[PDB]
Write a protein that binds this ligand. Structure first.
Ligand SMILES: Cc1oc(-c2ccccc2)nc1CCn1cccc(C(=O)Nc2cncnc2)c1=O
Ligand SMILES: [Mg+2]
Ligand SMILES: [Zn+2]
Length: 313
């Protein structure tokens, strides 16, 4: 009860900022997560013994892939932490609990391959789940780990609170399917401009939580340039591996995934920032004004990719 987590001074200060990098010391990421749950939720939200056992089972069920790994899980949870802390009064006790857990679990047991690749490979998961294939798998794994003896971090919730929190986590994890983001943001855009956005409308919260999830999922574009640039290598290492696997099925991959087209990466980053990242953080800033630093950092990195193209690096 009276046991807090405390971080070194630089981390204690920097962890509050959106652009925080969790660092290369794997062994400190669990403490970083608990620290965030305690300041975001309360020291009382979860039994520390059960939380710590949940965290380590979740870590174990992330795989050794270049990008969709344990470090991504914690990076995405930290961004959600910064959004929740800069928007104190907007979210329920249940939402704060559910969303940090949703983020930590959002890519559980990822193999480093897109939903497309599962479908063309004809992976069993593609037969079991026709849309948002990996994302329904991630939710499935989350519920599995929650049902291990000693791992029910929600045991103190009522039968109906427990159902609301698992339903927040499910919608939250499904929303990380980037195919669903485009229409989700178009609707949020229309609702905000025509003035119909209403945060007491549950179907409207759902949409806003989904955009937060896209924003946290993409947050590597909102870091300082050297973090963003080096994460971009991790992300292309998966894409090109998937491209290789497409070629093995007798299919020319999209250029994004073709390692023979490394040269077109700077232009692909531009497309991505203009088509996905910038629009995402724009609409998010409109709905949640204190998340503007994400939009600003994103624009800064777009400007850095433009410099790469002009041969200024
Ligand atoms: C459509 C297209 O075509 C090309 C292309 C084309 C020809 C030759 C080389 C690349 N790239 C893209 C977009 C690539 N893409 C798609 C999805 C997600 C990300 C992403 O989360 N990026 C990211 C970067 N740094 C930190 N965190 C995250 C991403 O970059
Ligand atoms: Mg994912
Ligand atoms: Zn992710």
């Amino acid at each position: 009860g009276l046991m807090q987590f405390t971080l070194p001074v630089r981390l204690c200060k920097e962890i509050e900022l959106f652009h925080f990098d969790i660092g290369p010391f794997e062994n400190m990421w669990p403490g970083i997560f608990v620290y965030m749950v305690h300041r975001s939720c309360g020291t009382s939200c979860f039994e520390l013994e059960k939380l710590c056992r949940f965290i380590m089972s979740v870590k174990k069920n992330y795989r050794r892939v270049p990008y969709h790994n344990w470090k991504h899980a914690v990076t995405v949870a930290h961004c959600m932490y910064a959004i929740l802390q800069n928007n104190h009064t907007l979210f329920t006790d249940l939402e704060r609990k559910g969303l940090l857990i949703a983020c930590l679990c959002h890519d559980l047991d990822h193999r480093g391959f897109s939903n497309s690749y599962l479908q063309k490979f004809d992976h069993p998961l593609a037969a079991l789940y026709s849309t948002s294939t990996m994302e329904q798998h991630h939710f499935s794994q989350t519920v599995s780990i929650l049902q291990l003896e000693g791992h029910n971090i929600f045991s103190t919730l009522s039968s109906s609170e427990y159902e609301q929190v698992l339903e927040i986590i499910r919608k939250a994890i499904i929303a990380t399917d980037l195919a669903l983001y485009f229409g989700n943001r178009k609707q949020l855009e229309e609702m905000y401009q025509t003035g119909s956005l209403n945060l007491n409308n549950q179907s409207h919260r759902d949409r806003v939580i989904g955009l937060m999830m896209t924003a946290c999922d993409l947050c590597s574009v909102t870091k300082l340039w050297p973090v963003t640039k080096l994460t971009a290598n991790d992300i292309y290492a998966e894409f090109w591996a998937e491209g290789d696997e497409m070629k093995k099925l007798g299919i020319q991959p999209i250029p994004m995934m073709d390692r023979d087209k490394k040269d077109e990466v700077p232009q692909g980053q531009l497309g991505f920032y203009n088509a996905v990242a910038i629009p995402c953080y724009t609409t998010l800033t409109q709905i949640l004004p204190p998340t503007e630093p994400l939009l600003k950092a994103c624009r800064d990195n777009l400007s850095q990719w433009e410099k790469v193209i002009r041969g200024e690096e």
